[PDB]
Amino acid sequence: SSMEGLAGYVYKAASEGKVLTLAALLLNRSESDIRYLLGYVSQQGGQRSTPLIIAARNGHAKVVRLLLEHYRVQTQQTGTVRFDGYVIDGATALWCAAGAGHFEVVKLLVSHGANVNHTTVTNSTPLRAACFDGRLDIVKYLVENNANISIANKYDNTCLMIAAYKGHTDVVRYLLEQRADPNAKAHCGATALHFAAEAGHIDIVKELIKWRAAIVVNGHGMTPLKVAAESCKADVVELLLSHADCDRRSRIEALELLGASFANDRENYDIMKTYHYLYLAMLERFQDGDNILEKEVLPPIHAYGNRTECRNPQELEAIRQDRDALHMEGLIVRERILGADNIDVSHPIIYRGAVYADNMEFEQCIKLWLHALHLRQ
Amino acid sequence: DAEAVQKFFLEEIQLGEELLAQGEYEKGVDHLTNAIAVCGQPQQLLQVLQQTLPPPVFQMLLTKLP
Amino acid sequence: TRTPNCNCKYCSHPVLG
Ligand SMILES: [Zn+2]
Ligand SMILES: [Zn+2]
Numbered sequence: 001s002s003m004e005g006l007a008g009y010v011y012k013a014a015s016e017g018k019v020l021t022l023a024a025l026l027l028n029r030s031e032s033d034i035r036y037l038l039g040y041v042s043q044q045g046g047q048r049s050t051p052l053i054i055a056a057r058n059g060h061a062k063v064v065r066l067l068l069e070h071y072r073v074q075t076q077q078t079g080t081v082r083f084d085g086y087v088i089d090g091a092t093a094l095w096c097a098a099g100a101g102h103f104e105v106v107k108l109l110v111s112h113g114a115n116v117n118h119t120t121v122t123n124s125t126p127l128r129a130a131c132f133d134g135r136l137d138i139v140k141y142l143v144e145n146n147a148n149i150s151i152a153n154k155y156d157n158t159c160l161m162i163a164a165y166k167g168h169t170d171v172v173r174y175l176l177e178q179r180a181d182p183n184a185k186a187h188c189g190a191t192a193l194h195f196a197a198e199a200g201h202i203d204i205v206k207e208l209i210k211w212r213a214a215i216v217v218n219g220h221g222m223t224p225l226k227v228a229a230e231s232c233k234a235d236v237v238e239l240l241l242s243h244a245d246c247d248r249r250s251r252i253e254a255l256e257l258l259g260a261s262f263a264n265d266r267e268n269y270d271i272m273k274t275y276h277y278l279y280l281a282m283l284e285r286f287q288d289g290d291n292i293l294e295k296e297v298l299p300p301i302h303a304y305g306n307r308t309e310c311r312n313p314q315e316l317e318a319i320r321q322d323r324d325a326l327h328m329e330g331l332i333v334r335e336r337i338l339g340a341d342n343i344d345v346s347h348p349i350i351y352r353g354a355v356y357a358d359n360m361e362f363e364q365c366i367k368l369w370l371h372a373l374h375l376r377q
Numbered sequence: 378d379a380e381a382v383q384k385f386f387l388e389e390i391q392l393g394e395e396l397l398a399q400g401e402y403e404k405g406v407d408h409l410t411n412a413i414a415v416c417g418q419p420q421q422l423l424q425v426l427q428q429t430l431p432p433p434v435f436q437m438l439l440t441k442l443p
Numbered sequence: 444t445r446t447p448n449c450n451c452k453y454c455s456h457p458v459l460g
Contacts, residue, residue: 020397020409023425024390028417062429070421086447086460122448122460132447154460155449165450188454195450220453231452343453 003033007040014051014067015044017060026071038073046087048080056093056109057081059102064093068112075114090121098126098142101135106142116147122154131159131175134168139175149180156187165195169203182213189218197228197236205236209243221341225250229257230338232268248284248293255281257337263330264348271326275316278329282316298336303349303371304328305364309336327352331368339375346372386412402434410441 006025013022026034041048052073055063067073080089081096088095094114097105106126110116117125127147130138139159143149152158160180163171172192176182185191193213196204215223225246228236237258241251259277262270285293300306307325309332310316319325331349338345353368389412396405409426413419426435446456 018391018394019425019429020394021387021390023422023429024387024412027422066425066429070425124448153448155451155454155456157449161450186449186451188451190451190453198452218451218453220451222453227452342455344455 003036004040007037008042010037011040011042011044011049011051011054014055014060014063015049015058017055017058017063019060019062019066022063023066023070034071035074038067038071039077041079045082047082050077050079052077053079053081053091053093053096056102056105057096057100059097059100059105061102061104061108064105064108068108075109075112076118088120088122088124090119092118092126094118095120095124095126095129098135098138099129099133101130101133101138103135103137103141106138110141110145116142116145117151119151120153123151124153125151125159127151128153128157128159128162131163131168131171132166134163134166134171136168136171136174139171143174143178149175149178150184152184152186156185158184158192160184161186161190161192161195164192164201164204164208165199167199167201167204169201169207172204173207176207176211182208182211183216185216185218188220189216190220191216191218191224193224194218194222194227197224197233197240198231200228200231200233200236202233202235202239205239209239215240215244220343222338222343223250223254225254226257226337229254230261230334232258232261232265234258234273252281252284252293253337255284256333260330260333260337261348263327264334264352266351271323274326274330275320278310278333279313279316279320282310282313286313295336298332298339301332301335301371303367304332307332309333344376346375349375382415386415389415397430397434403437406434406438406441409438 010025013025038051041050052067076092078090078092080087081091083099094106094109097109119125127139127142127149130142149159160172160175163175183191193208196208217223225237225240228240237254255277259274262268263274295311297309297311300308305328307328319329334345334348349368349372353365357365389408392408393405393412396408413422416422444458446458446460448460449456
């Protein structure tokens with residue numbers, strides 16, 4: 001029908017910003033025709049969008065003002081959008097505005113009575129989109145107009161967690177001030193502290209510790225200290241060790257994991273730190289000859305050269321200068337501390353294999369890749 | 378002819394839009410008047426233009442009323 | 444290339460969401 005093409009014209013006008021031609025196309029219509037043309041879900045570029053939500057997405061605030069003031073377009077009409085590569089089903093205009101960072105459109109929608117806590121199919125509130133993008137102005141304006149900071153999403157991810165993972169320190173501080181629970185756990189038991197420790201954002205860790213966050217072990221069996229050690233975040237490891245009264249086994253575990261992770265991380269490769277942390281943990285294992293904290297080593301792994309992990313300071317000093325042995329020791333310690341739990345520990349193995357292949361030592365590369373594949377099954 | 382009238386109204390509004398955006402305010406006001414005169418009742422049209430336009434171009438447009 | 448709905452490195456979600 002020609003009304004469908006006219007709805008296409010209206011959608012193009014709203015999606016580009018032309019307020020005058022939009023009012024021209026919407027002029028002297030009937031409320032029936034108004035509702036039809038403004039509720040017609042289109043489909044341009046893998047996005048199913050009604051004129052209001054495409055306008056709010058593209059940040060054309062005067063268009064949204066026309067729609068909200070001269071007409072009364074339904075404020076909770078939903079569609080499907082695309083942010084970079086992600087597809088988002090069940091999004092409202094306010095959510096798209098809060099995500100794309102159009103503070104003017106956010107205010108226009110909130111003032112005219114939009115559901116501030118409307119959720120996505122992934123159960124994402126617009127407050128969570130704002131915390132993702134880091135727009136503290138939008139976060140503040142939403143919270144002021146009674147947006148619920150507690151609403152988690154599909155996988156029980158809060159606004160605090162996504163704010164801590166992305167690094168928006170000021171938004172994290174604001175949320176913590178607004179009585180946001182720092183000990184909120186995700187579906188797997190991970191807190192915002194785990195996410196902040198992985199990314200290395202140390203200021204977020206400082207703020208979370210200031211608000212008395214708790215070091216909980218997630219379902220993967222990892223303290224935030226273990227998360228920081230595994231990710232070669234030495235600053236976070238030192239901070240968490242200083243604040244928490246970690247027992248000697250946890251501290252030695254963290255030191256050994258941090259040292260081992262420095263041996264096969266492409267970004268943080270540092271053999272001297274590897275040996276330093278491994279040797280420090282060994283020394284503290286042998287601090288008291290009458291109370292030696294022995295290490296329950298795993299059986300020899302053929303791909304790692306059938307080598308057994310060093311069990312005393314002499315065995316570790318023996319490989320102080322053997323760079324290859326230190327690589328293999330890092331892999332062994334990573335597998336001993338993490339392999340039991342449900343963790344994909346295969347990536348540094350593949351990296352060490354790739355380096356050995358770059359140096360044309362094909363046999364060891366193939367051994368390492370075979371072991372990684374055997375671990376995956 | 379109703380087809381020609383509707384297409385002319387839309388055309389003049391688009392021409393307005395672009396000319397106003399470029400900076401040629403007077404020719405845009407001319408095309409806006411071309412559209413308004415062929416409008417059955419530009420009541421809400423003038424009311425919208427009251428907000429979606431700077432004051433001076435609105436004064437020029439109202440001086441272009443007849 | 445991780446899921447945006449869960450910021451846990453140790454989960455195993457099907458990318459996408
Ligand atoms: Zn997890
Ligand atoms: Zn998860």
